[PDB]
């Protein structure tokens, strides 16, 4: 019932903007529980992308709930995001 998430984006490209939009509305409306979403621009904070071995943008790295998993893409296929937040089997 706690989410710690990092969203790695690349500037303000449409894929990144879409992913942030999708991900935000899921957390505030269909998620219940406490969460913190960190949005990181790899063009501005590359070292953070090196630490987490990020290759693609946008990338969603779930820290909590366990186990740690990565989701790539603008997050159009929402179910893959819901399963990670545990809101659906």
């Amino acid at each position: 019932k706690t989410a710690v998430l990092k969203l790695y984006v690349a500037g303000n490209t449409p894929n990144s903007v879409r992913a942030l939009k999708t991900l935000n509305n899921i957390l505030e409306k269909e998620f219940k529980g406490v969460y913190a979403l960190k949005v990181i621009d790899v063009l501005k904070n590359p070292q953070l992308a090196e630490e987490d071995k990020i290759l693609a943008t946008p990338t969603l790295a779930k820290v909590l709930p366990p186990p740690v998993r990565r989701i790539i893409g603008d997050l159009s296929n929402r179910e893959k995001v819901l399963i990670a937040l545990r809101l659906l089997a």
Binding site: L43, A49, E50, L55, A56, L75, K80
Partner: protein
């Protein structure tokens, strides 16, 4: 009118009339077990130990810890260079716990990580092994293709000399798998390994805008690549 930097790989600077085109990308293509990875390591190893030019090794399938020990298997201790901060292995291999795809994407983070590593370690030489693996870790060949081009473009702008290793289908056919020779096009080196006993060969298929010895030449793998019989 194009300048080259010496690889110091025995016999290569001669068949290539100086070495690799500075500030450019050279493809090094071949089937499995042709010495592409060995070529890529030796390139950076010499750059560091002979010319004190730091290097980045980008790996797409092999883990960094299997690069270092497969290098031991070739006769070189990379961990020393890493510990002096002259060699950096960028881990661009997949996460074994898996990566789920849930929409469209690009490889911007990869490009920025590489640029960042180049500037942090002041590198002038980069090796990328093996770029075809990417096509199999993501199913969007057209964006993968585009990102590889854009990576080459950025590497050029940063004024860095680069080797990209590439898998082949067969010893005599398409130059590189997934048609990467259509974007990274100017400089191509092919490595073959065919049968009594194995025969290994190196061919400089293309080195656009400059001179090179043409055709296949034989080489042996004995503590490095050793090319011979070329006058």
């Amino acid at each position: 009118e194009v300048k080259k930097i010496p690889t110091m790989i025995e016999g290569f600077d001669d068949i290539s009339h100086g070495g690799l085109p500075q500030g450019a990308t050279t493809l090094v293509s071949g089937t499995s077990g042709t010495g592409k990875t060995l070529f890529a390591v030796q390139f950076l190893y010499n750059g560091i130990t002979i010319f004190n030019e730091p290097g980045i090794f980008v790996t797409f399938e092999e883990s960094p810890q299997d690069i270092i020990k497969n290098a031991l298997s070739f006769g070189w201790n990379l961990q020393s260079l890493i510990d002096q901060g002259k060699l950096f292995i960028l881990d661009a291999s997949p996460d074994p716990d898996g990566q789920e795809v849930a929409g469209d994407f690009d490889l911007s983070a990869l490009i920025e990580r590489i640029q960042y590593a180049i500037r942090k370690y002041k590198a002038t030489r980069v090796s990328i092994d093996s770029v075809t693996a990417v096509f199999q870790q993501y199913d969007a060949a057209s964006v993968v293709r585009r990102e590889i081009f854009r990576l080459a473009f950025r590497l050029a702008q940063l004024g860095v000399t680069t080797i990209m290793t590439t898998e082949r289908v067969d010893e005599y056919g398409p130059v590189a798998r997934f048609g990467v020779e259509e974007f990274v096009s100017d400089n191509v080196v092919i490595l073959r390994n065919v049968l009594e006993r194995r025969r290994r060969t190196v061919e400089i298929l293309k080195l656009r805008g400059t001179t090179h010895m043409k055709g296949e030449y034989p080489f042996t793998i004995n503590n490095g690549i050793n090319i011979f019989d070329y006058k």
